[PDB]
Structure formats: structure tokens, C-alpha cells
Design a protein around this nucleic acid. Structure first.
Lengths: 65, 386, 136
RNA sequence: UGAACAGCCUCUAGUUGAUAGAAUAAUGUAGAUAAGGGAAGUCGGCAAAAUAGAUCCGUAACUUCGGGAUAAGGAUUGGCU
RNA sequence: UCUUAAGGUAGCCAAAUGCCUCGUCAUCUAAUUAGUGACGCGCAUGAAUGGAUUAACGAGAUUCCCACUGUCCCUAUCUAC
RNA sequence: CAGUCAAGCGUUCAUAGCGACAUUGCUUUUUGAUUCUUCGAUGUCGGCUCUUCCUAUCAUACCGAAGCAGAAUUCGGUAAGCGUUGGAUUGUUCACCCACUAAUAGGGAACGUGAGCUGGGUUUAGACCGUCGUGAGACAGGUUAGUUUUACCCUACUGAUGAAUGUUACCGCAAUAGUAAUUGAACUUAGUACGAGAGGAACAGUUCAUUCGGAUAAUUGGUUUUUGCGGCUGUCUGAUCAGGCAUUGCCGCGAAGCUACCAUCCGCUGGAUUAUGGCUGAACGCCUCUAAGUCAGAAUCCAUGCUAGAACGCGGUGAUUUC
RNA sequence: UGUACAACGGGGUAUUGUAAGCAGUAGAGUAGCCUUGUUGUUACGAUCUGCUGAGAUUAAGCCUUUGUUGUCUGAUUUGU
């Protein structure tokens, strides 16, 4: 078994927790929850959503580790 | 005329009447057929359904599309603190049924089982079994001869066992008591075995085994007065129906001039006794054992209790039974666990199950972490973590 | 399961009831296929037959090539929009529901399949598996 | 606000009148939302939903030449400087 | 050839008028007693007892298509009373 | 709808399967006949919903027969346990196609079912056409529009309490009543049996699925008055902060609870039998499943199991009031 | 008169998505002044950034509490 990484928020997907989305261009997106799975379809930007892992990495927030 | 197009009956008729159960602890009508060969063992156990949780395991049935591949399954975790034997009742066979001719109690019954006999424990003077425990003196002059009487005239003997309600995280303190048939030796061995176990404890690991095919017997979730559309699942009448549509339309023909019993009618739903058979035990854990929330594949030091504790319940701090699939009754509720009444030599029952991973994530929402250690690792330091 | 299918299809949640129009993932010239029945369906007083991933159905071409139009023809569902759960626990779904024209034995009428194909559909039907680009 | 004696909020003025209290079962009445499908329901798309203001682009058949026409069908829309 | 006062003309139609009749052919559909276009020895159409069209208009009737949806598949929930 | 005979059909042959000429019945599921009930009113077609019943059995269980090689099929027995559909057109019953399926069997219950719905038809008064009438008008001819009222009573039913049996509490038994599981596919057996070939099974095993049913909310989805957070408009509180109102202002997310074959799990095994096939064996020195006796056997019946527990069935046990 | 119960507070788990305030070499710029900068300066200026996965809410049917504060003999009836 393996744990996925959410395609939008970057949260860890444990077995079964979330959904899996297959776009027409055959690109697969695994969502940890409806929160990510809905913000995606709203055409929001992960780089702009403040709690997103991409946002955290981009703005370097918490990167002092 | 005849019904225009056939259709199945709405709802099973074998469960009528759909009245409230007699008591919150559903009785065990039937017990596994007795043997005189195997060692004396209990045929049941009392637990408190804590809740459900997710698992992943290798399905191991040949010829499956998923043979030797991961499968996600739902399990319900039952809290099972060790029951205490407090008495023994012998049954004689009569041409009118089994009749209990004698109950014999132990010396120092627990306060929590003494509460069972009272409704207003706060102001009661707690005289219960005072003269019985007094009678227990002179090395039980009456008790000894009364056990001999059971041995002389008894066909089936059941022990009275009660749960350590105080060990569970419930707000209750009035322990539940129950009769459990003893299968195993002959009558004398059973009562000798039971006498040895007076005011002594039995835990699950000694009665239930991994991969055993058990039944859950309990009172279902209640829902108060319920209309026919949900009680029986009857078709909803069309939208333009005058005087409501969550109904059944024709409750019977002109003749017989009576509403037939088998016609769906609105009323109580749930809180019925239900027996659900052929459930599989996945893990008989130990409350003393830490890290019972891990497997031979996961190797973490987290317990079975989900993060933030089971919803409405608390934590598991005692022995538990982690059984696949649903069980009747909701959380906090007493459930009865009973060995299967027949040998189940189906391949699905004989599957040798071993778990891979156990979901400890929070049931209280969409928690994304298995343990506070891992949760801390992901998010780093916080304005609160000083 | 269809007759030319290789046996057992685990229960995918049905999301394409009778009357649904799905895209045509193959290149036979049909643009969309409108379901008129589902092979292997059941019976109930007012229940519609419904289709799922990998089900063999009987469909009609409502829009597209003239000679495919105006007749019934078997089809095979390759993509479903109703999310369903696999055994391994994941809930997955395509954003398009679509099928491919096939003859009853299960050989596709078209030559190639556009877009992804459901793993259950490809696994169940060998011909769709051969012609499938990406399978998921 | 806005095209507006539309709708919504306020100023002067006037009321705070309509038997109440406690719970939140079924069935209702009224108001909503529903995954996938989209009339397969049904006598019948009944009821509901969708579109909707304004600026710009585009606008068919037919015609009594006046219309059809807001046809159809698209794009834009705040704030602040 | 018999008869009438003269024998339904121009047009139109299984039409709101056609019994047989779910007429026949074509179209619409997977399937159509529905719709539409033709056919007309038309029980029982027809000329101000007005005939045939007709743009526009219609809280008229009818069919099909796009969109839309709990009408339905199949029910679930929420609020007020 | 079912028989009785048996001319002929069926390669040969009346009875595998048919069945003329005749003939005997049964049912009330059609239409009639009557007018006995109701005209100080029994709401009247169909559909929708739902329950139950009959069997003259479409499918499924087990079987017998064949012009049954296999495959498919036909006839028949025990059998109503179990199921018998989705749609186009019609108000339609009926019918007719499309399609799936194991199958799409026929019927009853005041042509079940209108204080259950609908009101499409019919069936008031508006109106139009055709024909008939001089006319008013007529037309189970066509078309269009046409208020579908009341239950709080008794009973029935579904659920819910309840006095007394010394009191109260606990643990039980179980008479009785109900009952449930259903069907298909694929792989393998097996390209085997069978057949010249074409074609082409079945018993067991396994994995699944259909219809139904009982639970559960770990996961996914729905619902949102958590009015929880965030946002936005109009206005209002001097501005800021924070808020009010917009019958829940609206939008995004939204835990909990409820809930979905839209999610998950689970749905038991013994006897006795019917049909039928058998044995032993007379009646009838033979023969025969039958008479005496008896064996295997169906989705049958009764148990096991599940549900309620007689509130006028019952058991074991605890404690039973002093100032 | 207690592993008692409760109302608060604490922690956890959760939900949303970065509070108010302050500060800035952030900011389309526009008006004003000068010492004309290279962070000139005043007034107005959406929005951005840092403190800030922050702030708010969290059982009302979530879990756990070494904390605070309490509460704990009112009525009626019952006998073989």
C-alpha cells in the first residue's frame, strides 16, 4: 500500500480518504477531501489559497525547518 | 381486479411487530449446540460498541480479481472489558420448556452489579444480597448443597456475568447483567468451572479467537415515530397528490373489510432486537497492550483509539473486538457477541486474515493524520507550540 | 456482464440509466450514443435499467454519421461520471460518460479509443483493452 | 440603491395588535437543496428549474414591407488611482 | 341511359368534419392509434349556412427539438407554522 | 378452459405431438338474458400506490414422456414457495411494436382500491364541425374549456401506556402468531460427453452479479439554522472597529446528526414428504414400487435460526418499612 | 460527601482560512512643498507583505480534565 499526495492541497491521502478524478486529458487528480475536490473545480489557484502546501512552499512559510 | 404489474412485498414480514425492544440489551434466544467434549468455555460476551474505523488488508481468496491485493474494509470496534462471573443458574428440561430451578450467587458482588437491582441507588440502603452473603458463612452450608442440587438436576447451566461498566468511558455506572450458556464439559465440570470463577473475570482473548465467525445481537438505533415511506420503503405518491404523498395509497380492498396486518403502516422504527450473523473478528486486542493500533506491517506506537477519541464514546482503554462490517446498535450501546450456531466451512469464513493498517484518523470530521506525532511532523511549529 | 465479456465485473455504481446520452470514445463516426437498455439488467415495478463502467448496453446513435443513425447497436461503457468505489477503497470518476460501439460478441466497431478508459471496462473486455490508449 | 411613487434599508409619524408556555414524532401547509442520468414520470414538461438588468457584436424563414426582433447566438460587468 | 330544380364547380381533407379506421405511402422515433407531408368514389368537405391561404398577435389546442431541472430512476435532508 | 371416441396428419404409425365429424362438461375472467336488491344517492372507466388470494404454470426446484444423438424444443406431474420488467402510440381494458431478461402466465378481492390520488375518458351547463331536423334541437360521432367536499366517532390496523395477581427489582423459560431469501452469468469441468460433421452439454469447485430484506455511517456523496468561518451587494449605526435589517439577504467552504445498492456489511442447516424413481412381494404357483412392509427424494411441509412474548401462561433469585 | 455530579476555564480533535492593531524602501497614481531624493516630503490611495496555518467556533447528542466555583433528605405510596 501507499499514501497519495493530494493533487491540489498536498495533504496526505490515506487509503480511501478522499476521491480520485480522471480528467478528459487523462490527468489524474487525487483529492484528500471535498474541500480540495471543490476548490479545484472552482478554478481557484493552489498557489493563492493560503493553507495550500504549494502556497506554503511558494511563500516559504514555515520553511525555517 | 388483479394487480396490474407484479412487484415484491415492501419490507420483510419476518420481523413484525416493529415495536420497541423489551430492554436495551437484546436477549440471546438461542445458543450453540452443547457438547460434552471440548473444554468448558463461554458462548458469548458483553461489549459496548465504541464505533467504526477503516482498515486495509490483503484479500486472500483464490480466483478473485483482487486476490493478494489491497482491499479497504470497514470494521466496528467493540470495547470488551473483562466480564465478571457472579452467579450460576441451572436449567431442567420440562415438557413445557427449560425451567431454571436454581441460581447461586458469589460472595462479594461488585457495587456496579449491585446497582443493577436498584432504580434509585442514591438513597437506597444497599441491603441487596446482605443476607445471601451472610448465608455464605459457615463455608456456605446452603450454597454447597444447592450446587449439588444443580449437579443432580440440571440439563443446561448458564453463568450470570456482568460487564465492568466502570472501565468503559461511559457515564453509566449501573452494570448490565446477562446469562451466558456454558459449552464444554458435563454439568459438573461446568458448575465446578463456574464455582472456580465466582467473582472472577473472563476477558475476550480467552473466549473469542482471531478469525472466528461471531454474531452481534443488540437493540437497533431508534428513530421515534416513522412514516411508511421510510419505515417500509414504499413508493412515494406523485407530487400532485392531495392530502400528502409520504403515504401508502390503498391499504386494502373493499373485502375483507379490515386493514390487513401485512399492510405498511406508520409507527415506531428502530430500537428492535436484531441478530446479525457471520461477522469476522479481525483482531482481539489487549487494552493493557499499547500500540494495539498497529500491525506487523505498520509498526507505529499508536493505539486503536482514533485521534480525538471515538465520537460520542471516548477512548478504548480495555480489550476490544475489531469486527468487519456493521453491527446492529449504535455507539455507547451494549451489544452481545455470540459464537456461530453452526460450523461455517465456507471459504470466505475460513480466510486467514491479517491486517496491514488501521485508520486512527479522527472520526470527528476530515482529519488527515494518524497520530499527533505525525500531525506535528507535517505542520511544524505553531503559535501554540511553545 | 455482456456475453463476450470475460466474466465477472464487480459492482460499479450505476450512473447511466436508460435514456442517458454518452459520448462516443471510438472513431466509428458516431458522436454520441443514447442508451435504450442494459444487458443483464433486472426487473422492478418502476426501476429504470441503468449502466455502469464496463457494462455492455444497447444504444442508438442520436447524432453523427448517417448510416450509424436510426438503428440499435450494442455499445460498451468506457467512462462514467458517477463516482464509484473500487475494492481497494478509492472513490474515482471521470468527468465524461462515454462508450464505444461494439458488436454483440464484444469486438469494437471502431479502430481506436479516444481519452482514458476505465480499468474495469478494459479488464472485462479484451478488445477495448487492446485499442485503449490510457487505462485507469 | 436604482430607469423607476418597482424590490430592499432608513428619517418624521404610528403601531409593536393577531391566546400563550414546553418540546421538535409521523402526515401536512409554506420555503429550499440535492451526487449520476435528464421527461425514461405523466393524458399532457402539470409543478419546478433555467434565461433575465445594462453596453457592445450578430440576427434567419416568412411578410400585408409596417414587422418578425430583445429573433437565434456570443462577449463585457466590482473596487481604486 | 334513368332522374332532378340543378347534380359539389374552383378549391380542401382521415382536417375540430372520415363510420371502416390504429385507412395507404413518406417523414419523425429503437419502437409512434401521436405530429407532419402527400393520396381522396369524401358514411357525412366546399364557397359571405363563406372556400383556400395568410405576416403579426394568442393566459386557445397539438407535436417535435435545444436548454433546464427531484417529474422520474430513488429517495434523503433542512427551516418556519 | 377441460375431457370422451378416433377419420385422417405425422417417412412407416390413429393416440410422440396433433385431431376433423360428433359428443359430455367446468368457470364467471367477456358479451348477453332476467329485474331480486338499492332511484328520501352504495360516487361510475382507466391509470398510479399497496396487500392478499386462486391455479387453468411464463420462469425457477425436482421429475415422467418424445418423431429426446448432443444442443434446442414440445407434452405432462408434484407444485402459487418465488418472481413475472423498462419504453414509443392510445384515457384506454385490450392491442401493437422496441428492448432487456430466467420469464416478461392468466385472473379475483363491490369490473379491489376517488373522505388514497389524478380527472385523461365518460358525464351538466360554454363552444365548433359533420349528418339528420322547417324549427327548437338530436348524435356510446369527432374537438375544446370544465370546483373531485368532511374523519376528532366505532371498528380494523400500525405503533404506545396501563389498575390487580403481597410490594419492588433482576435474570429467565416459551404456548402462540409471523418468517425470506431470490435468480442469473463467467472461469473450470470442456471444445469433453454426444454426433460423420455441423454443432455441442451436464454433476462438482470457484468468482461474481440480479431482485428482495435487516442493520451501520469507517470511507464517498447529499442535506446546512453550528446561521461555524470567509466573502459580497443595498441600506443603517458620524468614520474605524463591530454589528442590525433584507420572512434563513446571497455566495464558497462547512463539522455533527440524519441518510444513499449514490456508501458499507450481513442474510442459517436438519428432518419428514409430494411428484417420480426404486426394493422386497403377494394378490393372480408367473409377474408387479403396493395391497401388508419399505428406500432416495421438490423452490414443498415441519423443525433449527430470527421477531414479539399470553398485558387473565409460568419459573429462579434479591430485598422486603419499629419509633 | 465521592475514581460523585454540575457550571466555567485548560488541552486535544475538528471547521474555516490568515483577525484587530501596528509597521513597511510594497502600491496604479494624483494634488502640495522643498534641501531634487535615488526610502525627499505632506494629504488621499483600492490592494499586498510581516507579526499570521493566524483569528474566530468547537457539543448544543465530540474526547479528556492535577484548575476555579458550587450542589448534594423535597413530595407521594406500597405488606405474604
Amino acid at each position: 500500500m501507499k499514501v497519495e499526495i493530494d493533487s491540489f492541497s498536498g495533504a496526505k491521502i490515506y487509503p480511501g480518504r478522499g476521491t480520485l478524478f480522471v480528467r478528459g486529458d487523462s490527468k489524474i487528480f487525487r483529492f484528500q477531501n471535498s474541500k480540495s475536490a471543490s476548490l479545484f473545480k472552482q478554478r481557484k489557484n493552489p498557489r493563492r489559497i493560503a493553507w495550500t502546501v504549494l502556497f506554503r512552499k511558494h511563500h516559504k512559510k514555515g520553511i525555517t525547518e | 381486479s388483479h394487480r396490474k404489474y407484479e412487484a415484491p412485498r415492501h419490507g420483510h414480514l419476518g420481523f413484525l411487530p416493529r415495536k420497541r425492544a423489551a430492554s436495551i440489551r437484546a436477549r440471546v434466544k438461542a445458543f450453540p449446540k452443547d457438547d460434552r467434549s471440548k473444554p468448558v468455555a463461554l458462548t458469548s460476551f458483553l461489549g459496548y460498541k465504541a464505533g467504526m474505523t477503516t482498515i486495509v488488508r490483503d484479500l486472500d481468496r483464490p480466483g478473485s480479481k483482487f486476490h493478494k491485493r489491497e482491499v479497504v474494509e470497514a470494521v466496528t470496534v467493540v470495547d470488551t472489558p473483562p466480564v465478571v462471573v457472579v452467579g450460576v443458574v441451572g436449567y431442567v428440561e420440562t415438557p413445557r420448556g427449560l425451567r431454571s430451578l436454581t441460581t447461586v450467587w458469589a460472595e462479594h458482588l461488585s457495587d456496579e452489579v449491585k446497582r443493577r437491582f436498584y432504580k434509585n441507588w442514591y438513597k437506597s440502603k444497599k441491603k441487596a444480597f446482605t443476607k445471601y452473603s451472610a448465608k455464605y458463612a459457615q463455608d456456605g452450608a446452603g450454597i454447597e448443597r444447592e450446587l449439588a442440587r444443580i449437579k443432580k438436576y440440571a440439563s443446561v447451566v448458564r453463568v450470570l456475568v456482568h460487564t465492568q461498566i466502570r472501565k468503559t468511558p461511559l457515564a453509566q455506572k449501573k452494570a448490565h447483567l446477562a446469562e451466558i450458556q456454558l459449552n464444554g464439559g458435563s454439568i459438573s465440570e461446568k458448575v465446578d468451572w463456574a464455582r472456580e470463577h465466582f467473582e472472577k473475570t473472563v476477558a475476550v482473548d480467552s473466549v473469542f479467537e482471531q478469525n472466528e465467525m461471531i454474531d452481534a445481537i443488540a437493540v437497533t438505533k431508534g428513530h421515534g415515530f416513522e412514516g411508511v415511506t421510510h419505515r417500509w420503503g414504499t413508493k412515494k405518491l406523485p407530487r400532485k397528490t392531495h392530502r400528502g404523498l409520504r403515504k401508502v395509497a390503498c391499504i386494502g380492498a373493499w373485502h375483507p373489510a379490515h386493514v390487513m396486518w401485512s399492510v405498511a403502516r406508520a409507527g415506531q422504527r428502530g430500537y428492535h432486537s436484531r441478530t446479525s450473523i457471520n461477522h469476522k473478528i479481525y483482531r482481539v486486542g489487549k487494552g493493557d497492550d499499547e500500540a494495539n493500533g498497529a500491525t506487523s506491517f505498520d509498526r507505529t506506537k499508536k493505539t486503536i483509539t482514533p485521534m480525538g477519541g471515538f465520537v460520542h464514546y471516548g477512548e478504548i482503554k480495555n480489550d476490544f473486538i475489531m469486527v468487519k462490517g456493521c453491527i446492529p446498535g449504535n455507539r455507547k450501546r451494549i451489544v452481545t457477541l455470540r459464537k456461530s450456531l453452526y460450523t461455517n466451512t465456507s471459504r470466505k469464513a475460513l480466510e486467514e486474515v491479517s491486517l496491514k493498517w488501521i485508520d486512527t484518523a479522527s472520526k470527528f470530521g476530515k482529519g488527515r493524520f494518524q497520530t499527533p506525532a505525525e500531525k506535528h511532523a507535517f505542520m511544524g511549529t505553531l503559535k501554540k507550540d511553545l | 456482464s455482456g456475453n463476450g465479456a470475460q466474466g465477472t465485473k464487480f459492482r460499479i455504481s450505476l450512473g447511466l440509466p436508460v435514456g442517458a446520452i454518452m459520448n462516443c470514445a471510438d472513431n466509428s463516426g458516431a458522436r454520441n450514443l443514447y442508451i435504450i437498455a442494459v444487458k443483464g439488467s433486472g426487473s422492478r415495478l418502476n426501476r429504470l435499467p441503468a449502466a455502469s463502467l464496463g457494462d455492455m448496453v444497447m444504444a442508438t446513435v442520436k447524432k453523427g454519421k448517417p448510416e450509424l443513425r436510426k438503428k440499435v447497436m450494442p455499445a460498451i461503457v468506457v467512462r462514467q461520471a458517477k463516482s464509484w468505489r473500487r475494492r481497494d477503497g478509492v472513490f474515482l470518476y471521470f468527468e465524461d460518460n462515454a462508450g464505444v460501439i461494439a458488436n454483440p460478441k464484444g469486438e469494437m466497431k471502431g479502430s481506436a479509443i479516444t481519452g482514458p478508459v476505465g480499468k474495469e471496462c478494459a479488464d472485462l473486455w479484451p478488445r477495448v483493452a487492446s485499442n485503449s490508449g490510457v487505462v485507469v
